[PDB]
Design a protein around this ligand. Structure first.
Ligand code: CL
Ligand code: CL
Ligand code: CL
Ligand code: ZN
Length: 311
């Protein structure tokens, strides 16, 4: 008898009119249902709910198409993981630190803070509208949705230990890096030499050394024959490159890199900070900011600006 009008959605843009019985739960009428992140599946409608938007799971073909077009995923648990994260990230704080949106420390989110600070310093466009829209809001300071999306895309829950390199890998997978190209040459004294071409995400990430100059000069790797072959960078076309390695004491010089991630800890427990090279070296640690003329610390990732390099 008693009803209210509400709207359901999967993208918070296209709304679907619903009339709900106030004597049954949302779950009985829609399946799993969320109100700005809060799980209301076992709740009966409130008068204050009239006219509000609820997220639901894509349970008919219209919602399936809308969800895929917005998120570029068909993982069945995606929307519930995104809402579950959002219920936490909407209570985090996003101070502006040295002109960049950061995140006040909470819930082991230090890896997200330094990923978010890095994105704001490299040229990158996302493909899913969900990330496009949310990143735009994050840049303006309202990063809760963007953080909850990163958690959902990376299959990490709030509180879980994250790795920055992994996280950037997922984000780059959803970015337009089609123009990026890398050419490598690997030289073995017994085996000869062999050139490789990498594209897309693989053309901007390297795991083994932090130094972009070292990568151009050559780095030693196993060869199949048993000896030490040498790999060096012969050509690069991309707006940035990311150089990563297991954390090691490393010296960062002002004006020689864009930004970097520092990791202190061990494989199951640690803390990331972000170092950015501007008019001096700034260390952003969530809401905290310090500066110094030189830097040395356990660095794990270094980002460098690029455009075209040929050897
Ligand atoms: Cl929708
Ligand atoms: Cl109320
Ligand atoms: Cl974007
Ligand atoms: Zn060899």
């Amino acid at each position: 008898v008693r009803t209210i009008k509400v709207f359901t959605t999967v993208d918070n843009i296209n709304l679907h009119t619903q009339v709900v019985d106030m004597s049954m739960t949302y779950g009985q009428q829609f399946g799993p249902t969320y109100l700005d992140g809060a799980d209301v599946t076992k709740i009966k409608p409130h008068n204050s709910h009239e006219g509000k938007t609820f997220y639901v799971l894509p349970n008919d073909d219209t919602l399936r198409v809308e969800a895929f077009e917005y998120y570029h995923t068909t993982d069945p648990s995606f929307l519930g993981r995104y809402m579950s994260a959002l219920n936490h990230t909407k209570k985090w704080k996003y101070p502006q630190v040295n002109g960049l949106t950061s995140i006040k420390w909470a819930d082991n989110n230090c890896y997200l803070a330094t990923a978010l600070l890095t994105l704001q310093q490299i040229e990158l466009k996302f493909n899913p509208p969900a990330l496009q829209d949310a990143y735009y809001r994050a840049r303006a300071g309202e990063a809760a949705n963007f953080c909850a999306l990163i958690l959902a895309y990376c299959n990490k829950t709030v509180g879980e230990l994250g790795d920055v390199r992994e996280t950037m890998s997922y984000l780059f997978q959803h970015a337009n890096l089609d123009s990026c190209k890398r050419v490598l040459n690997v030289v073995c004294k017994t085996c000869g030499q062999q050139q490789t071409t990498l594209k897309g995400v693989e053309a901007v990430m390297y795991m083994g050394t932090l130094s972009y100059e070292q990568f151009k000069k050559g780095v030693q790797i196993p060869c199949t024959c048993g000896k030490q072959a040498t790999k060096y960078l012969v050509q690069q076309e991309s707006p940035f490159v990311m150089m990563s390695a297991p954390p090691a004491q490393y010296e960062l010089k002002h004006g020689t890199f864009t930004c970097a991630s520092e990791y202190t800890g061990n494989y199951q427990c640690g803390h990331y900070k972000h170092i950015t090279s501007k008019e001096t070296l700034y260390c952003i640690d969530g809401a905290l900011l310090t500066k110094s003329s030189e830097y040395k610390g356990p660095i794990t990732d270094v980002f460098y600006k690029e455009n075209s390099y040929t050897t």
